[PDB]
Amino acid sequence: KREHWATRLGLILAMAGNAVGLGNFLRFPVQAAENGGGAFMIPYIIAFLLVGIPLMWIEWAMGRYGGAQGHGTTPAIFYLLWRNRFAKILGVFGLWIPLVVAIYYVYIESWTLGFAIKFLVGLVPEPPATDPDSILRPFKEFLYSYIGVPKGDEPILKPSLFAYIVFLITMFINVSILIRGISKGIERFAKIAMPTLFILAVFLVIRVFLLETPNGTAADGLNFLWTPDFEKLKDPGVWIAAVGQIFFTLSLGFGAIITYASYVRKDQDIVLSGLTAATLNEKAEVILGGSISIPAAVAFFGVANAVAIAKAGAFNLGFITLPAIFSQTAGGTFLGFLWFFLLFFAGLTSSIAIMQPMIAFLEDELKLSRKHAVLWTAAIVFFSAHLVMFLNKSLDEMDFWAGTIGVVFFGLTELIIFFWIFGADKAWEEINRGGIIKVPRIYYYVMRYITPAFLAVLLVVWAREYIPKIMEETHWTVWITRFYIIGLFLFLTFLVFLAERRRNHES
Ligand SMILES: CCCCCCCCO[C@@H]1O[C@H](CO)[C@@H](O)[C@H](O)[C@H]1O
Ligand SMILES: CCCCCCCCO[C@@H]1O[C@H](CO)[C@@H](O)[C@H](O)[C@H]1O
Ligand SMILES: CCCCCCCCO[C@@H]1O[C@H](CO)[C@@H](O)[C@H](O)[C@H]1O
Ligand SMILES: CCCCCCCCO[C@@H]1O[C@H](CO)[C@@H](O)[C@H](O)[C@H]1O
């Protein structure tokens, strides 16, 4: 009846693949540097222990629970968990979030593929020594020419022809994997991509470790992230930043886990498999990820400038700073190729995970073939992405409502539906059923009180500090993007309507 993962190992590597592309290498280093890396470890571990693990297991169980009844998607899974019309409209969010994220994410993934192509061939800017900004500016210009950034006032992006071609290639590659299916495509690619990612990261970590400059060494930069500033541990903002990173550490709230877990067999383990996968992502995020960006930056610019450059963001550190830092070292363009090849493969395992929920919806509810479901989903993403490519703050706008506010809000709804409405006793049985290991009794208290309290705190905080703080100082072109992604929610709600009408006719 339903597709299933062939092997336990490929399932875990596939699941681990979702979180890797969502800034695993870039986000964690920045959050630690802003909040004191050594000090930041304790909040990060508490959040991973009291938020990430419980929610991951909740998502795994909801996916597998729905997959037994033939549904991999939250409109139907919520309705099975909660027999109410409002659960179906709430489930639309769980389709909407991964779809909106995909609209701009695959485009960003294309940037790594294009940059990797340009670096491999050596078609990169070369700074002439040494001025911190004069090294950074020619690469900042390089990204802007690729994206088509205007002067600054204009809201129009003029993407390069090369960047458009690469976006098509990137989309075609996504389709090649997704069209093969769960085991022939996703699972086969994850068994190839994850080890390749591991070798590049380790290779990069060793290479970065050997970087030295009169401004500093890379070993000094590594020491900045493990020596604690215990005085910064008392700040509530560090705890707010720790919980938020965990969502990107494990790709919680994007719907990828649920849809993936729907192809887990009804009696297969989710307790050990999900715990292993979440451990893989955390180890890769801390060890491998938190050892390439910051240490290389500290070596070239010293500790002080590095924090000022780490405050420029995780994206400014990934496409401008690190390529400019590798630009000066021996074999540096090839190291930039490796860095960008790493990002692309990490993106590939993630872009296929957030496009699979829409593919599952068409198959499960509208009864489309995999071929048609993959192509139609590809068409919708490719078409909608023209908004992200040509409208200036459009990417930023989708990232906020879907990938920032949306995922955290949806994570709380998953908890309440499964553990409060569906029943905490029922949900506990569903989680631990078929488990190689069993969840400890303490997590029943955590999943029912601690985890929802932490999320509601993060939300109300992330709300008041982001949502209504500045609703008036955004340019008027943001309404274009808001109008479109609101139309997408109406489109999905109509499809859920059609799906019920066909299900009321198949009787
Ligand atoms: C395959 C479907 C094509 C849809 C066309 C989208 C609008 C065209 O897009 C433009 O194409 C030009 C070259 O063709 C590029 O130079 C421009 O960068 C790009 O903006
Ligand atoms: C692996 C393939 C990567 C994409 C290669 C296509 C690069 C498109 O690049 C374009 O090619 C044109 C020539 O036809 C030139 O006139 C344009 O200046 C150039 O931007
Ligand atoms: C595509 C047509 C959209 C029309 C835009 C809505 C009317 C303009 O609304 C604008 O919204 C901004 C929100 O940040 C405010 O800062 C501006 O003051 C306001 O003029
Ligand atoms: C913001 C919440 C409102 C978004 C638009 C929902 C209004 C449409 O209502 C929809 O009608 C359908 C009838 O079958 C039902 O399947 C859906 O559950 C219901 O949400």
Residue numbers in the entry: 4 to 131, 134 to 512
From the study:
We obtained two crystal forms, which however display a closely related crystal packing that is also recurrent in other LeuT structures: a C2 form with one LeuT molecule in the asymmetric unit determined at 3.1 Å maximum resolution, and a P21 form with two molecules and determined at 2.5 Å resolution. The lower-resolution C2 form structure was obtained at pH 5.0 and overlays well with molecule B in the higher resolution P21 form obtained at pH 6.5, for which the molecule A is slightly more open. Therefore, the P21 form is the main subject for further analysis as it shows both representations of the same functional state and is determined at a higher resolution. Thus, the extracellular cavity is exposed, and variations in the degree of opening (comparing molecules A and B) correlate with how n-octyl-β-D-glucoside (OG) molecules bind in that cavity at the Arg30-Asp404 gate, similar to the outward-oriented, Na+/substrate-occluded state20. At the unwound part between TM1a and TM1b, we observe a key difference to the Na+-bound forms at the substrate-binding site: Leu25, which is conserved in all NSS, has rotated due to a neighbouring flip at the polypeptide chain, and it now directs the side chain into the vacant S1 substrate-binding site. The Asn27 and Thr254 side chains both interact with Na+ at Na1 in Na+-bound forms, but now interact with the buried Glu290 side chain (molecule A). The Asn27 side chain shows variation in the two molecules in the asymmetric unit. In a slightly more open molecule A conformation Asn27 adopts a similar rotamer as in the Na+-bound states; however, interacting directly with Glu290 side chain. In a more closed molecule B (similar to the C2 form at pH 5), Asn27 is moved away from Glu290 and interacts with the backbone of Ala289 and Asn286 on TM7. However, we observe residual density in molecule A that superimposes with the molecule B rotamer of Asn27 and a water molecule, thus indicating flexibility of the structure in this region as also noted by relatively high B-factors (see above).
